[PDB]
């Protein structure tokens, strides 16, 4: 039932945002899940029976003790690992503005599918190195957004070096974002320096693929290094797992990896077709 799903997402996004501005976001969220109705039905009743996987919806499901997808969200993209492992090593790095940054680096090859609402990609990477990104998407901005996420996730020093101011991004409670989301917010604001300094390479013009230049125009001849746009589309089930959620709505899998947080919830939403009554 897609009207319910879409109304559920809208309600869930609104609730997660409001619960973020409190001394106990988990407690606030749960209260709001219990006090909110959609089409005249309590949200908890819908969450318990609705299969939608969306970041705010899954934060609410975790708060209620319900299983969600085992995939993590970064930059709005659901990352499903298809190779390599999760083990990471801390490193202090230095941005292009001479600000230090403590990041957690996986060593060794990994491979992911990135599934977004407006783009899909295959990401192959090694230690602090983008090997390949193959991305398809609905429009130029949506592909650019996937490319930015993938460059940040790569943790390549070219990307750290392209940072051009101090990084003091916060959430809705004015609490500072973690290092990778600092980097994500910076380049989401303006990616020109990152794209211009990343590097380009000649491409083999092959059917269904096209290059993409640092100014985000398609090219048959060159492309951002390691990046290709799929005109035919990248292909893409849900493993549902028991999760935990802490006071600040950070959701973790059994091994302690963070899957979701309020920072992974879209800032936009549709228009509900079922009436949502809050409180």
């Amino acid at each position: 039932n897609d009207d319910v799903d879409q109304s559920l997402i809208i309600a869930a996004r609104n609730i997660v945002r409001r619960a973020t501005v409190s001394t106990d976001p988990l407690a606030s969220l749960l209260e709001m899940c219990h006090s909110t109705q959609i089409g005249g039905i309590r949200m908890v009743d819908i969450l318990r029976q609705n299969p939608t996987e969306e970041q705010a919806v899954d934060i609410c499901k975790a708060a209620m003790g319900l299983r969600i997808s085992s995939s993590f969200s970064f930059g709005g993209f659901t990352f499903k690992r298809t190779s390599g492992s999760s083990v990471k090593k801390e490193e202090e790095v230095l941005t292009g503005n001479l600000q230090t940054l403590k990041i957690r680096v996986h060593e060794g090859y990994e491979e992911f599918t990135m599934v977004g609402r407006r783009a899909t990609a295959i990401l192959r990477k090694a230690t602090r190195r983008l090997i390949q990104l193959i991305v398809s998407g609905r429009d130029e901005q949506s592909i650019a957004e996937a490319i930015i996420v993938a460059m940040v996730f790569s943790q390549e020093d070219c990307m750290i070096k392209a940072v051009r101011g101090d990084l003091n991004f916060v959430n809705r409670a004015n609490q500072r974002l973690n290092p990778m989301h600092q980097l994500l917010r910076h380049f989401q604001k303006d990616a020109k320096v990152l794209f211009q300094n990343w590097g380009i390479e000649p491409i083999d013009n092959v059917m269904g693929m096209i290059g993409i230049l640092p100014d985000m125009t398609p090219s048959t001849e060159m492309s951002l290094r390691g990046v290709r746009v799929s005109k035919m589309g990248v292909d893409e089930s849900t493993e549902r797992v028991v999760v935990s959620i802490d006071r600040f709505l950070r959701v973790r899998d059994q091994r302690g990896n963070v899957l979701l947080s309020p920072e992974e919830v879209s800032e936009t939403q549709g228009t509900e077709r079922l009436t949502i009554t809050y409180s």
Epitope: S136, R138, G233
Partner: nanobody, 116 residues
Framework: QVQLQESGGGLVQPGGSLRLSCAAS????????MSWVRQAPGKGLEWVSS????????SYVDSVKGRFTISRDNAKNTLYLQMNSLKPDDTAVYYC??????????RGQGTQVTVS
């Protein structure tokens, strides 16, 4: 000889409705996903909605979700966009395109929509 021709734009008031049409020709329409994209004042080409070949599965940008409905009549080689609860920010030239992946090789001439 792929040809796309949009129809149905106009000047309307907030809260109003319009129905865009796009007649396709020069390809087997039934075998292609189709999309609507738009160019609002000051901006680039932004995707609005996609629909698969059979018509059963649809996708929308958040800003139109719950207000716009994409549909298609494969018998008549026509793509539609029902725009309800129109807002000033829906002002744009609306284009029909083949497929659902950017960059779009085939785009119509556009139909202007102005909500004021």
């Amino acid at each position: 000889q792929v040809q796309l021709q949009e129809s149905g734009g106009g000047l309307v008031q907030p809260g109003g409705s319009l129905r865009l049409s796009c007649a396709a020709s020069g390809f087997t329409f039934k075998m292609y996903a189709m999309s609507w994209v738009r160019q609002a004042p000051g901006k680039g080409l932004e995707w609005v909605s996609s629909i698969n070949s059979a018509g059963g599965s649809t996708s929308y940008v958040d800003s139109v979700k719950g207000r716009f409905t994409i549909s298609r009549d494969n018998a008549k080689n026509t793509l539609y966009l029902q725009m309800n609860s129109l807002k000033p920010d829906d002002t744009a030239v609306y284009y029909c395109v083949q497929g659902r992946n950017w960059p779009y090789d085939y785009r119509g001439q556009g139909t202007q929509v102005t909500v004021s």
